[PDB]
Structure formats: structure tokens, C-alpha cells
Predict the structure.
Amino acid sequence: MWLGALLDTLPTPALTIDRTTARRNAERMRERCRALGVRLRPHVKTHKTLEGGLLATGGTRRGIAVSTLAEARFFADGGFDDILLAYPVPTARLEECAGLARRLDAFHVLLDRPEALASLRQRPLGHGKRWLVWLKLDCGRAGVRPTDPAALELAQAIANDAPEEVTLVGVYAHCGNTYGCSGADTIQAIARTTTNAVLSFVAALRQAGVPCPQASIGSTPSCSHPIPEMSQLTELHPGNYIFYDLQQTQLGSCQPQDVAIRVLTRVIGHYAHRGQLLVDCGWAALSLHGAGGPQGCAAIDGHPELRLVGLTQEHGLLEHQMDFGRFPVGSVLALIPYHACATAAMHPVYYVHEEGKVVALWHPVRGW
Amino acid sequence: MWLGALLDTLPTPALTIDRTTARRNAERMRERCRALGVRLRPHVKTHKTLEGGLLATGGTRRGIAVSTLAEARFFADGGFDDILLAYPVPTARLEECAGLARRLDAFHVLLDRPEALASLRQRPLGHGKRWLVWLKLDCGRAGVRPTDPAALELAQAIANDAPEEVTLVGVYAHCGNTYGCSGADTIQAIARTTTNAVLSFVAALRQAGVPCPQASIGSTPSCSHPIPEMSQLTELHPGNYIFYDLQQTQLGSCQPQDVAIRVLTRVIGHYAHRGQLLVDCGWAALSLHGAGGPQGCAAIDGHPELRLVGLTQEHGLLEHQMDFGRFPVGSVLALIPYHACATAAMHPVYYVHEEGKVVALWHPVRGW
Ligand SMILES: *Cc1c(COP(=O)(O)O)cnc(C)c1O
Ligand SMILES: *Cc1c(COP(=O)(O)O)cnc(C)c1O
């Protein structure tokens, strides 16, 4: 246990979260939504922590999105509610989904196939509770396409075919496509194509008389530079924005000062005959994200000079011709990881801090 | 808890270990060593499990190699001893190394820099115990080069400069270079270059009068096709061979029938308009190894037809023109992962099985 400890005292490699930066990130996204007049349902997958969720959620512990039944359970066990399982409802685990729907005032699920509706229908929740269902629209990983007349029919069914057992809460899209882009304008165009598609669908839905009270989109890059059409929605659900990361910096969603995550590592050897620094951060601590070479898995914070050039499980090699005097063995560097969600999943504890000193330890759940 | 359960009953994605194949793998490597007349010190990093270690070690719980102080501790807490920390001794965590050296009859460390020796010297173990030190030879990630006269001097010091506080147990190389190769002959050439280098060093060591009783090398690929010169060593320390994996199959260390690990995943959606299967195994469950694209992170066991073409955190996309009838939603596929050590690190439990039925659950340690 390390309360109060100075950062470069921790056993590395060690994932670190600047609680100042995080709180700042949470409140900033809360305000954007306030500004747009819509609700924020933060996704928890970058941190999978109660504390994390608590920040995102402004202290309220209600209205979030999870990627696994593990997180659902964890969050439910920690007192959260209004929990959306942002994932095509897993028909092979319905006893569990029903379990949570019964504990919770509001447990929401998504689906995108008529068969999924069938499966729900044959596992009625009972107790007056109805399956709160959202229709995942693909505007291109999963969901139904809004122009496919099949989407309309499916909405129709979820909403109406059994209103005592199933209800259509809204439509749900995740504009993840914004990750292949580059710079704010193409981010916004994907936001716009997605916002408008969704808006047209709902238009079509009102016209046909299919009640659909909510409409959800969002990803860190589109919600980092929100666009006016968005206020015609009811909720945005980004998540990663609480931490941010190198990729997010490269995309333009944020400035470096916004990235709350680092992986602290130590210089544990010099290698003059190959000009390389040796660090105790391998990929067990960092993950291979941003490689498919290693140069782009991470940046050495405060040191454009150095770049990662190798990663074994428990080692990384750094290069500059070098300067080993500036980097005595035992000195700590701070790696800026490419994909926050991925680094986060390699750590059983996060060292959370303020003013260089450790202030808390968050423990994420994992598994399925 | 799932004792006895049928495999395709498990909550996927789920890492699975064929205990038959594993036991077979353990005994096979035990026999190779018996044949060569040398000792086997299995590395535990592919599984990081007590059960795992127990197999490798033939039931004895002695003589293994770990990659982190976490594993050291775990194994020590589980009754193992003769534990080699196969890693340049971490000078910033010496209170802990000393801790374990004091609990254990035999805790071994490696180093490759004179300064490391200094640091050990100023943290004497006391209690009559001496730091059991091995000299990591680089024959090309870390260690000293055997032709560099500095290596000789360092051996000299470890062995002799303070024989009441520090002793040189042997020399240690890891012929990891065999991972860029391809086919048995270049594997063996790297084995040979490494074996001979090591043998020449020890020759030089005897000549100079530096006592060096042990000599350790090994990696799964060189120990999968051992070479005669190896019997002039005292110990081989591979590890991954207990599980094996796709990469190992591609290299030629093993035949498919040898790979004991799978990640079971489910078909949870069809996508005719893009010809794709949707599976609940994303990279949270598989890792991005073998990508730097996704085609090569894994193979669909029993189905050369399909290949992985996308991986998000909790999803993978499969392609063939398809045949969705052969793959009803809910049917289970078995992914063969590229790098066993990496997939293993994404799982908090391994479902171990025999004859299709689950026989145990191993829980690996993690962290640092
Ligand atoms: C991760 C995720 C989100 C969150 O979006 P980010 O861009 O990661 O902040 C939203 N919806 C789904 C389905 C997700 O998996
Ligand atoms: C992983 C490791 C080994 C084990 O070799 P494999 O080829 O993975 O079986 C041996 N020595 C060191 C230092 C290692 O990190």
C-alpha cells in the first residue's frame, strides 16, 4: 500500500493516472454535454474501475456503458445502475442478463438481429420488468444499416410486438470509424454522417409510429469535437476521453496536457555497443498496440529524443548516438502509451496521483 | 466453478488447456533432458501457474525460472524452491530479492553489469547465505558478450572478489534469437553458435581458474530439436513448450497436435452484406500478437477456410464467399493463438480439460 508515496518510488513498470487530469477530463465532457443539452453515458472500458466510473459519472453512480458481463456485474455490485451493456446481447448468457435486469432498476441491452429478439421473448424477465432494448445501428463493425428496410421492421418489432415484455428504449450507434481518420474535420464528417443517419432513422421511426424516445451515439474523437447537430440527440456515450492517449493525441482529439495515463518504467541497463537503453517495461506492461514496428507503441514523455525500438515480454529497448549520462540506471521515465484501453488491461492496479504524490489505487475487473 | 462441464458449455471467450497435451509436453521435455544427461529448469512465464509449474517440474516443485518478482513470490508462497529469477537482477528492488533469498534454500539471480555486483555487495544477505549469481551471456537482447574481455573480468569478480557473500553459480544464455528464423536447421545453428560460445567461455573460465560449475541455455525452439553439443551443458531452461502455439507451429518446433492452448469463442452474429462471421473473441482475449495485419493472430482450429480479419477489444470478424449454415449462431470455434505467452496473460482463469470435459481451473498471477 502506497498512499502519499512519491512517484519515482513506485515498483515499475507501473501504470499511473493523474487524478487532476482525469477529473478535469470528466468534468470537461460533462460540460460539453450540458452545453449541447444532452445526457452523458460514459463507457467504462478504458479503466473498468469503480473509482473511474465514479469520476465519469460525476459522483452519481448512474448511467454508464460496459463491454462485458463482468463489468456489468462489478458495477452492479458497486452500487451503479442504469447500466447499458453496449454489445449485441449475448444470447448464450441470458440467464445472467436476466439476473442483472432483475437486480437493477435499469439494465439496458442492445441487439441487431431478429433472432435475438426471439431469444429474449423466450426468456421473459417476469416481475413486471421489461427487457430494455436498444437497436444498434450500423452507420461499420456491427448493427443494422438504417436504410435497410429490415432495420425498420426490427425496430417495429422490438417496440411493439410484445410491449409487456420488451421495450425499445432508443437507437444506438458507435461512430468508431473515426479511428482511421486524421484531423478534426474528418472526425466531424464521420460524426455528421452518423448523426444524420441516426436522425433520419428516428424521423422514419416517428413517421411509421414506432415510439423511440432516445438516441445515443459517440466516441472519444467525435465527442472531443462535438458538432451542433448532436444536440438533436438525447445521449452521447464516449469513454476513453477520461484518460486519452498517444493515438488520441495523433488524431487531434486532445493536446498532450490532456493525457492522464503513463506507464512509469526504469532504466535498468545501458548498452553502449548497440547505443541502447534498457527499460523494465516490456509488452506485459504496455501491450503491442500501435505497432502493426514498436516505435509507435509509446512515446517517452519529456523526451522526443528517444524512441521505443524493441519490446519483449518484460523489457523494452530505447534509442536516441546516445547520452547515457543523462539517463543513469535507476532513473525513471514515463511512457505515453498509444491505446489507453489496451495498456489499462495489462494492469491489476493503477497508481492514481496528485502533485507527484500517490493519492489512490484503483483495481479494475477483468475477464468475461 | 465448472468441474466436469462440457467444453462448448463454458462462457466464452475462454482460454483452454488440454491437460493431456500439456502433461505430454512436460514429460517429453523431461525425457529429452534425461536423454542429454542434463537438468531441466522450466521457465514459467507462459502460464504463471502453480499447476503449470507442477507439471513442468514433474511433481517436484523445485528448479524453475521466473520473469518477475511477482512470480518469484507466488511460486515461493506455493512451496517451490530453487527458483531462478531469469532477469538482470533489479537493483531498485533489492530488499525484495534479499527477502526471497532468505526464505529460500536456493534463489538465483542474474546480472550482466559490474555495478549490479556493487549493489549486491552493499546489500549483503547475512545469515551465512550468499547471493547465488549467474552471469547472463549475450551470445542479442541483454547480457555480456563472451569475447568482450569485460565478461571474463566480471565472472572473475562474481566468483572470487567476495566468496563469503556472493558466488557464481554458472553462466546463463537465452538463445531467443531463434524466433526470427524459420525451419529446424537455422534454429539448430543458433543453438550451436550459442552452445559453442557458452562452452568456449567456460573453457576460458577454467583456464583462468574461475570456478563455474553450471552452464544453462535454452528456448523452446532449440530445446524442441536439441543438438548433441548440448549435453556438455548442465541445464536447459525452455518454458513455452508446455503449451506451444501457432508461431511455434510455423517455426517447426512442434506439430499442431502438440499445441495445448486454444481460445474458445462463439459465433454471435452473421453479416451476409460483408460476408463475415462475428465472434466474441476480441483482443482482450487474444492479444495483438502476430499482427505486426490480424490474419495471423490466430487460426480457426479445424477450419483452414476461415481467417481472422478484424479485432476490436471484445470482437473478432471472420471471413471465408461464406457458408453461414455451417456456422449457426451459438456454435463454438476454437482459436489457435499465435503467441501462447501473450494470450495467456489476458486470462484470469484457464479451463483445463481431458476428453472434452473440464478437469481443472488454474489461476495465474500477474503484475510486478
Ligand atoms: C468502447 C466503446 C464505446 C466508447 O467509445 P470510445 O471512442 O472508446 O471512447 C462506445 N460504444 C461501444 C460499443 C464501445 O465498444
Ligand atoms: C521466456 C524466457 C525463457 C524461456 O524461453 P522460451 O523460448 O519462451 O520457452 C528463458 N530465458 C529467459 C530470460 C526468458 O525470458
User: Anything to note?
Assistant: Chain B has two domains: 1-18+243-368, 19-242. Residues 111 and 136 of chain B are 6 Å apart (CA to CA).
